[PDB]
Design a protein around this ligand. Structure first.
Ligand SMILES: [Zn+2]
Lengths: 84, 37, 141, 200, 129, 83
RNA sequence: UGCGACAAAUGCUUUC
RNA sequence: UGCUGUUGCUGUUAAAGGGUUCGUAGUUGAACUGUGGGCUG
């Protein structure tokens, strides 16, 4: 304690525990990833919350199982979060 | 009659636009020759 | 859903403040436009077109890459649907309910929901006629 | 007739000025001797060049005006063009600004409905600021209203670009006042998503 | 639904002042709200405030100094001629020695004392004391 | 400070105290209001003659927020260190 | 029909 | 006589919220085009 709070300049601990539309300025929760392939090893950009079918070009084309939140990635692929 | 009077007077502007495009291309051709020499 | 019913839910997307492409996106704007038109010819509606580009194609917010919106691009190319997208889906829902109700005449809950949907169609068609997106004598069945 | 004079306005090429001739000279010599600029400079030309002296700076600012038709052309090579022109003018900072028109706000409600929003002073002034800091983007904006009655605008930039733009912020603020007659202040934000301000 | 942005903001400020808070967040904002706050600031009833941009109707953070008793809007915005200032003063102000009625006129938004000096009427927006 | 007649003299008797936290007048019937004096200390660690005095209104104490109010008052006054 | 000069809020020495 | 209430009334239990929804006239309806500047005292 012993420290006041400025509504205009909140701390990181308080701002992190907020709904995306309850922050001082609202913003997204999602991001993009670079994803490899099982036994094919190609490059595809996949949304973190994808709900349609994402397929590998010229391959088995089965990845990105959709859920009620973030999509699940098949164990045969490596993923890396893209910047920005 | 009103429709036929409007149609020609509002669809002869295509020829005018074609004239404008052709004129500009000729000026560019002139500028391209100027850059040639 | 607050127009009809007792729902008070607040679940939607939140657009970012920074409207610039992430700088790893190498697709040119003219390729994105051709990319939108091809998906329309396959038969997909504009709301489904945006999701296909977002999910497996790297393009979030087509408007930020190419300065235009998806429906504006389709209107320019002559690929816009004859009836607005939201009106098409509401009419399809009412048709499926009416087909169900002739076999099941005692389903009084479904009769109640049909009155709500038909009121929504008349309210929506009223707006589209005013902004001249529908013929002045469209007259839902 | 001078081949390098091709890269100027056809009105000003008749009796060119000293600073415009030097910039036009550098532009023509750059078309042939650069990989990235070889495929964009053939179609480019410049309206005018104006120099601005910043008080207590020991550096000058070269502001280059160009027509708005080449906005997307300049954006593609804004970084390479800026550095190359700076390597030819020691002790100077260059600034590529497009020439925009402003419609005065009408006093009639019917006229106000027909104003092109691209030509409002609100849209024009913020586009000028983006031009001067183009590799960076604005991540936030605030206005502070003092008890005396002055309102001051603060623009926040990403902290990842501090090392590349911090030494130019004093010149940017001065030129902005010279062009738009409005004040501006600058700050940096690490993690702009959570609105966290980095005070070095 | 929300019908008046100005009435919503003034109610929020008054409640925070009654509860002894030091800062209050106002959402959403508008041009009319900012002008009203500047009239309050000029007479010393609030401190500094900050406007935050979010590409929508923004937000305002206001600093309170404890000197505000009540602020509120008047709805609907009745017309007030230069001869009606006395009537409005006796009806909604605690006394004739302090407190202000805020109006919008052809010359801008101002308090009743400034409006009377310049011989102009208008519509009533709110009050504070 | 107070009301002046415009004749030159004060006509307002008993200018009241103002709560440090909330800047509100303290009435004569507020029997929960308190005044606290804190000793000043010299460099050697021995107290000094001077003292620091503050007042808290009764409403804050009954709500149970006087402790929080006292902390922020002393931090601003520099009586104690925040960290 | 030809010719001269200057603009252009969106690169024709361009795109497909 | 603020016991007709625009200023200015009441509606859990004193008199008084329609059993619940849909809906047309009617009433009400979010933000934005917008700090003029430079020289003297
Ligand atoms: Zn594969």
């Amino acid at each position: 304690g012993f420290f006041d709070a400025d509504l205009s300049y909140p701390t990181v601990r308080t701002e992190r525990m907020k709904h995306k539309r309850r922050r001082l300025v609202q913003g997204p929760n999602s991001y993009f990833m670079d994803v490899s392939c099982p036994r094919c090893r190609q490059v595809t950009v996949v949304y973190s919350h994808a709900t349609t079918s994402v397929e590998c070009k010229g391959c088995s084309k089965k990845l990105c199982r959709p859920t009620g939140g973030k999509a699940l990635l098949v164990e045969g692929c490596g993923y890396r979060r893209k910047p920005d | 009659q009103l429709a036929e009077q409007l149609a020609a007077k509002h669809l002869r502007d295509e020829q005018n636009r074609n004239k404008a495009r052709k004129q500009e291309l000729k000026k560019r051709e002139k500028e391209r020759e100027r850059a040639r020499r | 859903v607050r127009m009809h019913g007792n729902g008070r839910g607040k679940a939607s997307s939140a657009l970012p403040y920074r409207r610039t492409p992430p700088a790893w996106l190498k697709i040119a704007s003219r390729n994105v436009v051709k990319m939108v038109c091809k998906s329309s010819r396959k038969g997909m509606m504009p709301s489904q077109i945006g999701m296909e580009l977002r999910d497996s194609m790297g393009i979030a917010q087509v408007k930020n890459v190419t300065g235009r919106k998806i429906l504006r691009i389709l209107k320019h190319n002559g690929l816009a649907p004859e009836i607005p997208e939201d009106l098409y889906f509401l009419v399809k829902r009412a048709t499926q309910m009416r087909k169900h109700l002739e076999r099941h005449t005692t389903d009084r809950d479904t009769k109640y929901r049909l009155i709500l949907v038909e009121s929504r169609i008349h309210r929506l068609a009223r707006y589209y006629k005013r902004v001249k997106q529908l013929p002045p004598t469209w007259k839902y069945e | 007739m001078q081949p390098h004079l091709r890269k100027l306005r056809k009105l000003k090429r008749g009796k060119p000025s000293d600073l415009e001739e030097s910039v036009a000279k550098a532009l023509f010599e750059l078309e042939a001797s650069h990989k990235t600029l070889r495929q964009e400079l053939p179609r480019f030309h410049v309206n005018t060049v104006r120099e601005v002296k910043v008080p207590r700076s020991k550096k000058t600012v070269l502001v280059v005006f160009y027509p708005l038709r080449f906005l997307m052309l300049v954006r593609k090579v804004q970084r390479a063009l800026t550095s190359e022109l700076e390597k030819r003018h020691p002790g100077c900072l260059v600034m590529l600004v497009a020439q925009r028109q402003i419609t005065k706000r009408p006093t009639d409600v019917y006229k106000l409905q027909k104003v092109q929003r691209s030509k409002t002073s609100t849209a024009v002034f913020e586009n000028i600021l983006n031009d001067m800091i183009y590799p960076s983007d604005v991540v936030g904006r605030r206005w502070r209203c003092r008890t005396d009655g002055s309102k001051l605008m603060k623009v926040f930039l990403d902290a990842r670009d501090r090392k590349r733009i911090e030494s130019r912020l004093r010149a940017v603020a001065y030129v902005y006042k010279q062009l738009t007659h409005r004040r501006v202040s600058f700050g940096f934000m690490w993690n702009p998503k959570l609105q966290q301000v980095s005070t070095r | 639904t929300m019908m008046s942005v100005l009435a919503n903001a003034l109610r929020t400020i008054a409640s925070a002042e009654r509860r002894g808070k030091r800062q209050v967040l106002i959402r959403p904002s508008s041009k009319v709200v900012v002008k009203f706050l500047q009239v309050m600031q000029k007479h010393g009833y609030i401190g500094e405030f900050e406007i935050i941009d979010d590409h929508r109707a923004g937000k305002i953070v206001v600093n309170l100094n404890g000197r505000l008793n009540k602020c509120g809007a008047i709805c609907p915005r009745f017309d007030c001629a230069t001869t009606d200032y006395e009537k409005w003063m006796k009806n909604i102000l605690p006394s004739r020695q302090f407190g202000f009625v805020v109006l919008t006129t052809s010359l801008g938004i101002m308090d009743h004392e400034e409006a009377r000096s310049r011989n102009t009427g208008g519509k009533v927006l709110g009050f504070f004391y | 400070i107070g009301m002046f007649n415009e004749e030159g003299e004060n006509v307002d008797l008993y200018i009241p105290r103002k709560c440090h936290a909330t800047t509100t007048l303290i009435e004569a019937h507020d029997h929960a209001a308190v005044q606290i004096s804190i000793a000043n200390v010299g460099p050697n660690g021995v107290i000094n003659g001077t003292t620091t005095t503050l007042c808290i209104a009764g409403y804050l104490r009954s709500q149970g927020e006087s402790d929080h109010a006292i902390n922020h008052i002393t931090i601003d006054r520099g009586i104690m260190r925040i960290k």
